[PDB]
Every structure is written in structure tokens, then in C-alpha cells.
Chains A and B, each alone.
Chain A
């Protein structure tokens, strides 16, 4: 009972509150809150009645068991972590994909999934790259942004949508949501000069190019 109020002191650093336990006593008002003072299951039979047992004893032990293990404190399963970004990546930037069978195509970023991986969707008319998950580590950030806040991203697409099931054939919903996003993104990148052949061409090194020399 009683509503759950928010935590009264704020957080100053990771771990340290901004209020001590004295200004917190009077803040809590701890001046006016003084405090002073199954397994057996029966059944009928259509003899008598029988009493069954829940979770009954085993019928076969192995010749040797392994012992219990100790308890640590700070180990979480993967779905309960924190999620991070870099500094430079925003929605609407231009990336250089590296390691797929889409080696080196200049693509466009959308968002950060809940599992960590990125939602990288090239326009399929240009770079032959649809809505397709990639990973943050393997992506070089080209400092060239576009506006994004005038989109209506669907809400059913997530990691459960891209995740593997088991030849192949393309489902018609991949063709739907690819066309639906691309018909809203594409006039933004078409209206910028010299970009539909930029997203198009590939990154490649040559003699006289050192990566620690050019900024990109």
C-alpha cells in the first residue's frame, strides 16, 4: 500500500548521494513516523480415497554428483546490461560498412536497437542494401549527416524480426517496410547535391592514402 515515491536524494557521482543522512532525516520527515509494537493432496475414487504426493522422490540416482558452487554478486545475464553508444553517431549519419558481403558501401544510420546492434538501411535503389542489422564496432563514421526527425518508423520491427529462424526466399513484409521507409528517406538525400552517386560508390584504398592522415 502507499504510493511508491521517487528517490529523494539525487545522484552526484556513481555511488555517492548529494545529501547526508542528516538533511535526509529532516527531508524524509523521520520525526513523525515513529514505529513501536500443499505437498499432501487428497483425491476421490469413483476402495476409499487416495492421498497423492507432489514432487515425489526419485527412482534412479547416478553414481556421483557434483557439488554446489559459490555466489558472486555482480554478474548479470545479457538482457540486463547497460547499452552504450559512441560519441559521434547520431540518427541520420552516413556510415562506411566494412565486413559483410556488402563490403565497403556508404550507408545511412537509423537507430540503436535494444540489443546493441544498429539498424543500417541503405536505399535499395542506390546501394542494393536494405534494412539490415550491423554492429557498432565494425563501422566507420563519415561526418556527413542528414535530417531524420520527420519520419514515422514502424513499431513492430525489432531484433525479433531480424533474428534467424533455423534455400531462402524473401518475405513480402521485408519488401513492404523497405519501400515504406525508403519512400520517406529518399527525397531528403535526393535534394542534397551530389549524394545519390556518393552513397553509391565504394571506399577503397590506393597508393598515396594513409588512414591516419585523412580525416573522415
Chain B
């Protein structure tokens, strides 16, 4: 639950938890722009 203990034992967990956030927030924009690129391909 805590962070600045995990950093105290293992400081790389910083740059392993900064990732898996900018991926789990970059795929959601590349997903909604799918459902949009395809809902304008549905009215056709």
C-alpha cells in the first residue's frame, strides 16, 4: 500500500510503476479512437 518504503528497498520500482501507467493510459485513447473510427464507418 505504501510507496516510499518500496523506494527505500528498491528504487527501480519507481520507473516500473511510471510505466504500466503511461501504457494503461495510452491504450485507452488508442481504443476509443477505434470505436470512433468505426462508428463513423457504421452509418455508411
Contacts and interface: CB of A to CB of B under 8 A. Distances in A.
Interface residues of A, number: 6
B17 interface: yes
B4 A16 contact: no
Nearest to A20: B15
A20 B11 CA distance: 12
Contacts of B21: 12-13
A200 to B, nearest CB: 48
B3 interface: yes
A15 interface: yes
B22 to A, nearest CB: 8
Contacts of A20: 15, 18
A13 B4 CA distance: 13
Nearest to A17: B18
Interface in A11-36: 12-13, 15-16, 18, 20
B4 A12 contact: no
Contacts of B17: 16
Contacts of A15: 3-4
Contacts of B4: 15
Interface in B14-36: 14-15, 17-18, 21
A18 B25 CA distance: 13
A207 B15 CA distance: 60
Given A12-B18, A12-B21, A15-B4, 8 more contacts: A13-B21, A15-B3, A16-B3, A16-B14, A16-B17, A16-B18, A20-B15, A20-B18
